[PDB]
Design an enzyme around this catalytic site. Structure first.
Site, PDB file in Angstrom:
ATOM      1  N   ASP A 195       0.777  -1.224   0.000  1.00 29.07           N
ATOM      2  CA  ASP A 195       0.000   0.000   0.000  1.00 29.07           C
ATOM      3  C   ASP A 195       0.814   1.283   0.000  1.00 29.07           C
ATOM      4  O   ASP A 195       1.298   1.713   1.042  1.00 29.07           O
ATOM      5  CB  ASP A 195      -0.895  -0.054   1.239  1.00 29.07           C
ATOM      6  CG  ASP A 195      -1.998   0.963   1.226  1.00 29.07           C
ATOM      7  OD1 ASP A 195      -1.929   1.945   0.469  1.00 29.07           O
ATOM      8  OD2 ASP A 195      -2.948   0.777   2.005  1.00 29.07           O
ATOM      9  N   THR A 196       0.901   1.926  -1.158  1.00 35.54           N
ATOM     10  CA  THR A 196       1.639   3.179  -1.277  1.00 35.54           C
ATOM     11  C   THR A 196       0.947   4.360  -0.585  1.00 35.54           C
ATOM     12  O   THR A 196       1.553   5.409  -0.412  1.00 35.54           O
ATOM     13  CB  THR A 196       1.918   3.534  -2.747  1.00 35.54           C
ATOM     14  OG1 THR A 196       0.680   3.676  -3.443  1.00 35.54           O
ATOM     15  CG2 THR A 196       2.752   2.443  -3.411  1.00 35.54           C
ATOM     16  N   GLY A 197      -0.317   4.190  -0.204  1.00 35.66           N
ATOM     17  CA  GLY A 197      -1.048   5.240   0.489  1.00 35.66           C
ATOM     18  C   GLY A 197      -1.048   5.088   2.007  1.00 35.66           C
ATOM     19  O   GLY A 197      -1.814   5.752   2.704  1.00 35.66           O
TER      20      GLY A 197
HETATM   21  C1  LIG Z   1       1.708   5.069  14.666  1.00 35.28           C
HETATM   22  C2  LIG Z   1       0.685   6.156  14.932  1.00 35.28           C
HETATM   23  C3  LIG Z   1       1.139   7.493  14.357  1.00 35.28           C
HETATM   24  C4  LIG Z   1       1.017   7.557  12.831  1.00 35.28           C
HETATM   25  C5  LIG Z   1      -0.419   7.608  12.301  1.00 35.28           C
HETATM   26  N1  LIG Z   1      -0.415   7.654  10.839  1.00 35.28           N
HETATM   27  C6  LIG Z   1      -1.545   7.671  10.139  1.00 35.28           C
HETATM   28  O1  LIG Z   1      -2.664   7.618  10.672  1.00 35.28           O
HETATM   29  C7  LIG Z   1      -1.404   7.709   8.611  1.00 35.28           C
HETATM   30  C8  LIG Z   1      -1.637   9.108   8.082  1.00 35.28           C
HETATM   31  N2  LIG Z   1      -2.395   6.798   8.057  1.00 35.28           N
HETATM   32  C9  LIG Z   1      -2.232   6.166   6.904  1.00 35.28           C
HETATM   33  O2  LIG Z   1      -1.238   6.311   6.212  1.00 35.28           O
HETATM   34  C10 LIG Z   1      -3.369   5.227   6.488  1.00 35.28           C
HETATM   35  C11 LIG Z   1      -3.053   3.762   6.825  1.00 35.28           C
HETATM   36  C12 LIG Z   1      -2.680   3.484   8.272  1.00 35.28           C
HETATM   37  C13 LIG Z   1      -1.248   3.892   8.606  1.00 35.28           C
HETATM   38  O3  LIG Z   1      -0.391   3.862   7.690  1.00 35.28           O
HETATM   39  O4  LIG Z   1      -0.984   4.262   9.778  1.00 35.28           O
HETATM   40  N3  LIG Z   1      -3.692   5.329   5.073  1.00 35.28           N
HETATM   41  C14 LIG Z   1      -4.904   5.021   4.633  1.00 35.28           C
HETATM   42  O5  LIG Z   1      -5.805   4.632   5.388  1.00 35.28           O
HETATM   43  C15 LIG Z   1      -5.156   5.149   3.123  1.00 35.28           C
HETATM   44  C16 LIG Z   1      -5.840   6.477   2.787  1.00 35.28           C
HETATM   45  C17 LIG Z   1      -5.309   7.637   3.565  1.00 35.28           C
HETATM   46  C18 LIG Z   1      -3.997   8.046   3.415  1.00 35.28           C
HETATM   47  C19 LIG Z   1      -3.478   9.083   4.174  1.00 35.28           C
HETATM   48  C20 LIG Z   1      -4.286   9.727   5.102  1.00 35.28           C
HETATM   49  C21 LIG Z   1      -5.612   9.320   5.256  1.00 35.28           C
HETATM   50  C22 LIG Z   1      -6.106   8.281   4.487  1.00 35.28           C
HETATM   51  N4  LIG Z   1      -6.036   4.050   2.805  1.00 35.28           N
HETATM   52  C23 LIG Z   1      -5.626   2.793   2.875  1.00 35.28           C
HETATM   53  C24 LIG Z   1      -6.700   1.749   2.610  1.00 35.28           C
HETATM   54  C25 LIG Z   1      -6.119   0.345   2.621  1.00 35.28           C
HETATM   55  C26 LIG Z   1      -7.233  -0.702   2.611  1.00 35.28           C
HETATM   56  C27 LIG Z   1      -6.712  -2.003   2.077  1.00 35.28           C
HETATM   57  C28 LIG Z   1      -7.842  -0.845   3.990  1.00 35.28           C
HETATM   58  N5  LIG Z   1      -7.567   1.927   1.450  1.00 35.28           N
HETATM   59  C29 LIG Z   1      -8.789   2.418   1.588  1.00 35.28           C
HETATM   60  O6  LIG Z   1      -9.216   2.829   2.671  1.00 35.28           O
HETATM   61  C30 LIG Z   1      -9.626   2.506   0.300  1.00 35.28           C
HETATM   62  N6  LIG Z   1     -10.701   1.529   0.359  1.00 35.28           N
HETATM   63  C31 LIG Z   1     -10.805   0.544  -0.518  1.00 35.28           C
HETATM   64  O7  LIG Z   1     -10.014   0.395  -1.438  1.00 35.28           O
HETATM   65  C32 LIG Z   1     -11.973  -0.414  -0.327  1.00 35.28           C
HETATM   66  N7  LIG Z   1     -12.711  -0.638  -1.601  1.00 35.28           N
HETATM   67  C33 LIG Z   1     -11.480  -1.748   0.230  1.00 35.28           C
HETATM   68  C34 LIG Z   1     -12.215  -2.176   1.500  1.00 35.28           C
HETATM   69  C35 LIG Z   1     -12.049  -3.668   1.789  1.00 35.28           C
HETATM   70  N8  LIG Z   1     -13.324  -4.392   1.648  1.00 35.28           N
HETATM   71  C36 LIG Z   1     -14.123  -4.702   2.668  1.00 35.28           C
HETATM   72  N9  LIG Z   1     -13.790  -4.374   3.912  1.00 35.28           N
HETATM   73  N10 LIG Z   1     -15.307  -5.268   2.435  1.00 35.28           N
HETATM   74  C37 LIG Z   1     -10.206   3.938   0.068  1.00 35.28           C
HETATM   75  C38 LIG Z   1      -9.091   4.977   0.071  1.00 35.28           C
HETATM   76  C39 LIG Z   1     -10.999   3.982  -1.259  1.00 35.28           C
HETATM   77  C40 LIG Z   1      -1.168   8.807  12.888  1.00 35.28           C
HETATM   78  N11 LIG Z   1      -1.120   9.892  12.264  1.00 35.28           N
HETATM   79  O8  LIG Z   1      -1.836   8.638  13.935  1.00 35.28           O
END
Ligand SMILES: CCCC[C@H](NC(=O)[C@H](C)NC(=O)[C@H](CCC(=O)O)NC(=O)[C@H](Cc1ccccc1)NC[C@H](CC(C)C)NC(=O)[C@@H](NC(=O)[C@@H](N)CCCNC(N)=[NH2+])C(C)C)C(N)=O
Lengths: 99, 99
Positions: A25-27
């Site tokens: 996951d690049t996002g």
């Molecule tokens: C350690 C704690 C500190 C760091 C912590 N960091 C974060 O919260 C950072 C910004 N979050 C992220 O990077 C998170 C993933 C979790 C993570 O990496 O931590 N990224 C994400 O959640 C990114 C979108 C995003 C990016 C940046 C900001 C906000 C949102 N989405 C990732 C996600 C992966 C999926 C397989 C569950 N994809 C989706 O949510 C996409 N959804 C889909 O593709 C659905 N069709 C699939 C659902 C599955 N089917 C089912 N359940 N029936 C949507 C974007 C259309 C913080 N800030 O509190």
């Protein structure tokens, strides 16, 4: 390998000695794995996504193998709908987006 | 181009006559754009991610330009914290993951 995106980019990973399937996951800044027992010390954390925030257990310096490539870093364990390999570990294996 | 993952993979996109920044997300099946008044017919839909589901408006056959590359497909519009380009559009610009 060169991975196209017509299908979800799923790979086999080895964590805690056990095989799992995860999504490249690049996002995702971080790597989040479904709830499991992992040998180690952890600290509670909160991460956010599209629908909100979830509580996770943070494990540092964990050895994980992603499609045969070794990486050692932070792994978050919690109630994620799917296991995801984020940028923190993808940079370690030298993954890049190309087009 | 080749995009490294040290930082979030953000690119400039053009949609509905407007320029904006979006995140290339290989973990997103769909494309989600921040709330905007797009002309045309839409249909209600709920998409999920980490944390839960959000309500969005589904627009079909939307013309979008991703980093200078034209593509056309379904775009969901809703209260997303960031613009997300999913696999549905990434496959059209010939984007691949390589490691
Ligand atoms: C350690 C704690 C500190 C760091 C912590 N960091 C974060 O919260 C950072 C910004 N979050 C992220 O990077 C998170 C993933 C979790 C993570 O990496 O931590 N990224 C994400 O959640 C990114 C979108 C995003 C990016 C940046 C900001 C906000 C949102 N989405 C990732 C996600 C992966 C999926 C397989 C569950 N994809 C989706 O949510 C996409 N959804 C889909 O593709 C659905 N069709 C699939 C659902 C599955 N089917 C089912 N359940 N029936 C949507 C974007 C259309 C913080 N800030 O509190």
């Amino acid at each position: 390998p060169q991975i196209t995106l017509w299908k979800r980019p799923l790979v086999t990973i080895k964590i805690g000695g056990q095989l799992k399937e995860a999504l490249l996951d690049t996002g995702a800044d971080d790597t989040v794995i479904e709830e499991m027992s992992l040998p180690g010390r952890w600290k509670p954390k909160m991460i956010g996504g599209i629908g909100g925030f979830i509580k996770v257990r943070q494990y540092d310096q964990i050895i994980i193998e992603i499609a045969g490539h070794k990486a050692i870093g932070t792994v978050l364990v919690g109630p994620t709908p799917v296991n995801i390999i984020g940028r923190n570990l993808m940079t370690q294996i030298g993954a890049t987006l190309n087009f």
